[PDB]
């Protein structure tokens, strides 16, 4: 696994700007018939000035950003089952060792699970030994 660097290119500062704009259309226009109209009307506004000098790009951000911030829906279409959702992250689960501390009679309900649980545990130990040669 790789954790990305935080450096950003003006292309990304401009394209993710287009992304947020599309979102801001949603939060201000809902009807998909209405939307695709205005979303493609937005595209022309991102297309008429497609390629400009860097300096103009900086002023273009100086206007673009304000438009989002000054025209942001007071209730953005925050996404349901993602971070910031209206019901996301409803519950959590603890690390498996909690299952390790079941009372032996508590253990005695799912022997097949616990047996396989025991096997996988030793095989994980081998895996972790590998993970950096211990």
């Amino acid at each position: 696994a790789q954790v990305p660097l935080a450096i950003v290119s003006h292309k990304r500062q401009v394209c993710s700007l287009y992304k947020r704009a599309l979102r801001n259309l949603e939060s201000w226009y809902d009807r998909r018939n209405v939307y695709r109209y205005r979303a493609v009307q937005l595209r022309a506004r991102f297309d008429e000035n497609r390629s400009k000098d860097l300096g103009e790009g900086i002023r273009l951000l100086a206007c673009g950003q304000r438009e989002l911030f000054e025209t942001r829906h007071f209730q953005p279409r925050n996404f349901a089952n993602s971070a910031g959702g209206c019901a996301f992250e409803r519950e959590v689960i603890p690390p498996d060792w909690v299952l390790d501390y079941w009372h032996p009679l508590e253990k005695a309900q799912y022997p097949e699970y616990f047996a396989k649980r025991e096997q996988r545990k030793k095989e994980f130990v081998t895996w972790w030994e590998k993970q950096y040669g211990k």
């Binding site: 992250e89 959590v92 689960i93 603890p94 690390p95 060792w97 909690v98 501390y101």
Partner: protein, 446 residues
């Protein structure tokens, strides 16, 4: 009361005999049961043994002392796990128990002061012999010398009283009244440090933080109350002088209350929250007490008792975390609802009692104290409202953040809830619900 005293002395040998931690424990509870049976008192001094009496004010205080002193042994078992001189621990506890009984029953002021300040030692053993933090040293310095630096000076006031009075039985002082303007400060302030007062709260957070579960339970459960019990007995003759100079004390207590509550919000340690919280509640107790009105005093007696109980239970909770996750911090401790949900019930309940949710002998207090203060001065209401408001505020934060958020990633497998701790939490709370049925014994003492 010599019945109790001789019982405790004949319990002392069990400390030497090996493997008597649990035998001692049952006996201490059993004698508490016996002391429960002995109950017929009125306002007058009763059960007048050679120099030991007992009364409404002393009877409940003793019961709490015997109660909490037995609950120590439930709280602390790591001493047995470690074999960390269990004999010295048990001997220290019993010695402390005897001193408390003799302090609360000393019918003489001087006998009272004698045992009162004799308790300086065994408590210091309890922190130092079983402390954890390196701060344990400087903490012991704070505890002992804040106390002695004012607790010694009342020794002059006591003897001055003798010379002008001829004795030190409590009824005898009540017959007289003194207004020399130093007697007042010398006795008052000397008790105020152990109360403690917001301006001399300083030591108390340190003592609680770097002390074991047992010592902290003792410190917040009796020592603060013992200071107050002396006040109730002594202010009888300080009235006129108190009336002239009282606005200062009530002001700093009330002002300090909202402040220390805001300290609690910003604080980030379980014992620190409870320690500051206990100072806050004892701020209101000091206020109603210094009102000296009937409502204030009879309510103060109740709030001391209830506050001691709730503070103990919260300390057992703090011990539980400290003994599982090995760190007092708010940050490390979190989401315990996922690991001990049946325990988080008790977390909520003890928190509930500390924010004065009924049926709760604590709550019964604030009705009495708040009535007294409001009558005494309407101006108080502007700060009484905020004082209780922020009281509940930090308790909410303590309960939520500790038990609610998503778990901590780095946490090494620790055993789950167990009968000792479960029974310990019920035992501190359930009597705190019981008493309301018969508050009259815990509510009327004047």
């Amino acid at each position: 009361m010599l019945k109790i005293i001789f019982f405790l002395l004949f319990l002392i040998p069990f400390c030497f005999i090996n493997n008597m931690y649990w035998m001692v424990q049952i006996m201490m509870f059993f004698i508490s049961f016996i002391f429960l049976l002995m109950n017929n008192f009125m306002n007058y001094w009763s059960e007048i043994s050679y120099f030991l009496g007992c009364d409404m004010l002393s009877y409940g205080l003793i019961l709490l002392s015997l109660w909490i002193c037995s609950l120590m042994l439930l709280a602390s078992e790591m001493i047995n796990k470690h074999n960390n001189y269990k004999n010295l621990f048990l001997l220290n506890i019993i010695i402390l128990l005897l001193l408390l009984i003799l302090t609360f029953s000393s019918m003489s002021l001087f006998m009272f002061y004698l045992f009162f300040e004799s308790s300086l030692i065994p408590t210091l053993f309890l922190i130092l012999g079983w402390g954890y933090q390196p701060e344990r040293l400087q903490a012991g310095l704070y505890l002992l010398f804040y106390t002695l630096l004012v607790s010694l000076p009342m020794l002059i006031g006591i003897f001055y009283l003798m010379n002008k009075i001829g004795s030190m039985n409590f009824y005898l002082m009540n017959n007289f009244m003194f207004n020399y303007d130093l007697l007042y400060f010398c006795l008052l302030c000397a008790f105020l440090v152990k109360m403690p007062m917001f301006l001399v709260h300083l030591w108390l957070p340190k003592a609680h933080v770097e002390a074991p579960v047992s010592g902290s339970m003792i410190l917040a459960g009796i020592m603060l109350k013992l200071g107050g019990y002396g006040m109730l007995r002594v202010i009888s003759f300080l009235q006129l002088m108190n009336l002239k100079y009282s606005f200062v004390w009530i002001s700093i207590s009330l002002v300090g209350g909202v402040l220390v509550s805001l300290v609690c919000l910003r604080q980030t340690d379980l014992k620190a929250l409870i320690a500051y919280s206990s100072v806050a509640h004892m701020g209101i107790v000091l206020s109603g007490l210094l009102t000296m009105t009937y409502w204030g005093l009879c309510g103060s007696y109740t709030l001391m008792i209830a506050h001691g109980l709730c503070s103990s239970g919260l300390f057992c909770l703090a011990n539980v975390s400290y003994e599982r996750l090995g760190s007092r911090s708010m940050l490390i401790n979190k989401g315990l609802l996922n690991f001990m949900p049946s325990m988080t019930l008790w977390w909520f309940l003890l928190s509930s009692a500390n924010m004065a949710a009924p049926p709760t002998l604590n709550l019964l207090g604030e009705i009495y104290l708040l009535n007294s203060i409001v009558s005494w001065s309407w101006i108080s209401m502007i700060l009484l409202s905020f004082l209780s408001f922020f009281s509940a505020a930090y308790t909410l934060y303590l309960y939520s953040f500790s038990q609610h958020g998503k778990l901590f990633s780095g946490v090494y497998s620790f055993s789950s809830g167990k009968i000792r701790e479960y029974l310990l939490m019920l035992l501190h709370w359930l009597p705190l619900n019981l008493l309301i049925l018969k508050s009259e014994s815990f509510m009327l003492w004047l």
